[PDB]
């Protein structure tokens, strides 16, 4: 199961409900996406952060930054609040909200420097995301694959979504409850990729 065309996809309907993803290639025009990639690489306060798994302290294979007035904890590590949004990120937030009807107050930025950078299997299901969160994903730079696998019931469906320069992805509904996703390492050369995930964080 491969999704590479603009469209609205109900990728599953059970057990929790409809998991919906919407794909918008070219949401950001090509030249603007080039310029955004340059500015966000140059200006975002990127850091390589340390995770903790089973007492093991690891460097995440990606650079990250957080925006928004409320902290953000995943993999036992906490990204402190940055209420001063880069103006370009604020603008992209506003465009996404007006063109989708959904609001956001939090932005996680991932920079995948090359083919060895990645994010492992997870769902974005913190209690601080609330029930059935709405997540928006805007990508810049080299194409990388957003892989999804459906969580099995107490006891495997799979979707690959190539995310190209300027592509907007929306996840809503039961997607985080019923699916996991990752961005895998690649074996051929990759240029850098910036991904922006806009989310609503609650108190």
């Amino acid at each position, epitope marked *: 199961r491969v999704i590479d065309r603009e469209g609205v996809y109900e990728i599953s309907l059970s057990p929790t409900g409809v998991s919906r993803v919407c794909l918008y290639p070219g949401f950001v025009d090509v030249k*603007e996406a080039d310029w955004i990639l340059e500015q966000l690489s*140059q200006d975002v306060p990127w850091k390589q952060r340390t995770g903790i798994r089973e007492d093991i302290t690891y460097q995440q294979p990606r650079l990250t930054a957080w925006y928004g007035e409320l902290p953000y904890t995943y993999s036992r590590i906490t990204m402190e609040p940055n209420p001063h949004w880069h103006p370009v990120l604020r603008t992209l937030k506003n465009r996404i909200e007006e063109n989708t009807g959904h609001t956001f107050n939090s932005l996680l930025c991932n920079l995948y420097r090359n083919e060895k950078d990645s994010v492992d299997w997870h769902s974005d299901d913190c209690p601080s995301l609330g029930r059935s969160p709405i997540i928006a994903s805007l990508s810049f730079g080299a194409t990388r694959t957003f892989e999804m696998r459906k969580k099995p019931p107490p006891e495997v469906e799979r979707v690959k979504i190539p995310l190209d320069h300027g592509t907007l992805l929306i996840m809503e509904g039961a997607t985080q409850a019923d699916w996991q996703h990752r961005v895998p390492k690649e074996y051929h050369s990759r240029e850098p990729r910036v991904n922006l995930t806009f989310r609503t964080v609650y108190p």
Partner: antibody
């Protein structure tokens, strides 16, 4: 020679209008930024407007919003600044400028004088 | 009513070292440019990206960023380095552009 030429300048009564054009020669106005920047006699640069030629997105200085319109014709490699209801303080040398960046203006025309006077 | 100001003036002798500072407080970006203008001629670009020397600019021109302050440094002036220098403030994609007040470097006597 990667030139850039302004036309349409000159004199107009207050409340009147002009249409500056900037003909791009040598290079192409395909996926770049076009800026209009003005300079009153003895004063510093005042950025007036820009357009991202690929998407046609435009930005304007507050001193100018609602009265000017910047546009591009990829077909003729020509940019335009339509200036309406000109006030006396719009009097300046108007420059046309291009960049491969969204801001860094590497090519400049030599600018035409615009005089707004009764 | 005046839209901009007339350039500030700095007096220097040939071979002096000059660091012009451009303040852009609260800024969160290094998309800053520097331009030089001579009487009757259009500006020419010197530094882009806060610190990148433009194609074919003398190497004595330098530019750097410390915090929210941007600097254009001429290591030692030469006779044709006496001109007006404009700092293009941090330019955010989709936002307006703003030129700072010019700094007019003139020869001491």
């Amino acid at each position: 020679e990667v030139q850039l030429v302004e036309s349409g300048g000159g004199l107009v009564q207050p409340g009147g209008s002009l249409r500056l054009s900037c003909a791009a020669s040598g290079f192409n106005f395909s996926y770049s930024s076009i800026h209009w920047v003005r300079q009153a006699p003895g004063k510093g640069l005042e950025w007036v407007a820009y357009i991202y030629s690929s998407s046609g997105y435009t930005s304007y200085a507050d001193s100018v919003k609602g009265r000017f319109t910047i546009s591009a014709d990829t077909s003729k490699n020509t940019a335009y600044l339509q200036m309406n209801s000109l006030r006396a303080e719009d009097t300046a040398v108007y420059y046309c400028a291009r960049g491969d960046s969204w801001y860094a203006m590497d090519y400049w025309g030599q600018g035409t004088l615009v005089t707004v006077s009764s | 009513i005046q839209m901009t100001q007339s350039p500030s003036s700095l007096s220097a002798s040939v071979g002096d070292r000059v660091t012009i500072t451009c303040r852009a407080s609260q800024s969160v970006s290094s998309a800053v440019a520097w331009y030089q203008q001579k009487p009757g001629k259009a500006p020419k670009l010197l530094i882009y990206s806060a610190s990148s020397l433009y194609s074919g600019v003398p190497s004595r021109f330098s530019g750097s960023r410390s915090g929210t302050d941007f600097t254009l440094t001429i290591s030692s002036l030469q006779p044709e380095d006496f001109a007006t220098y404009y700092c293009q403030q941090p330019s955010y994609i989709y936002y307006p552009v703003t030129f700072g007040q010019g700094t007019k470097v003139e020869i001491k006597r």
